[PDB]
């Protein structure tokens, strides 16, 4: 989740942004930095 402050200055973290928080497809992508891996994640995330 993006609080809308300076949180995006730091490296992405799946646990922090997608598990402890709800995340968008893009936030997950900033973690994997691979669109296909994010697509695979997305299928199992929703």
């Amino acid at each position: 989740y993006n609080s809308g402050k300076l949180e995006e200055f730091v490296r992405g973290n799946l646990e922090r942004e997608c598990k402890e928080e709800k995340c968008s497809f893009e936030e997950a992508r900033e973690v994997f930095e691979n669109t296909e891996k994010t697509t695979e994640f997305w299928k199992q995330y929703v």
Binding site: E8, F9, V10
Partner: protein, 123 residues
């Protein structure tokens, strides 16, 4: 030769800044850092590589504004059913471009949001 606080590359001078600013404030700030100053522009991959490396070497991992703004406002947005685009409900009004200091890929971010940045001018 570039100012002591700047870095030289192929006839231009570059300098990364850590002060968080939105796109507009960053661009404006750059114009005030030296004559002909602007947010950094990438005319080639070599130039981009130089800048990304400089940014990481100076501040480590972070995000830095590049000189591209309102990137999709002039695009041909159309409804698939050909309906006239009158009503608007954009969550964000404008997007700007930036790079994450770990690689030279171009990324997008709402122009109103904050980021660090890199200024550039021709020596």
């Amino acid at each position: 030769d570039c100012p002591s606080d700047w870095s030289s590359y192929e006839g231009h001078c570059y300098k990364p800044f850590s002060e968080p600013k939105n796109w507009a404030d960053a661009e404006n700030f750059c114009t005030q850092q030296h004559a002909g100053g602007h947010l950094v522009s990438f005319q080639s991959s070599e130039e981009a590589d130089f800048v990304v490396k400089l940014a990481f070497q100076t501040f480590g991992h972070s995000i830095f504004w590049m000189g591209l703004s309102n990137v999709w406002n002039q695009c041909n947005w159309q409804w698939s059913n050909a309906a006239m685009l009158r009503y608007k409900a954009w969550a964000e009004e404008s997007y700007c471009v930036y790079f994450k200091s770990t690689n030279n890929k171009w990324r997008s971010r709402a122009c109103r949001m904050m980021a660090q940045f890199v200024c550039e001018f021709q020596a």
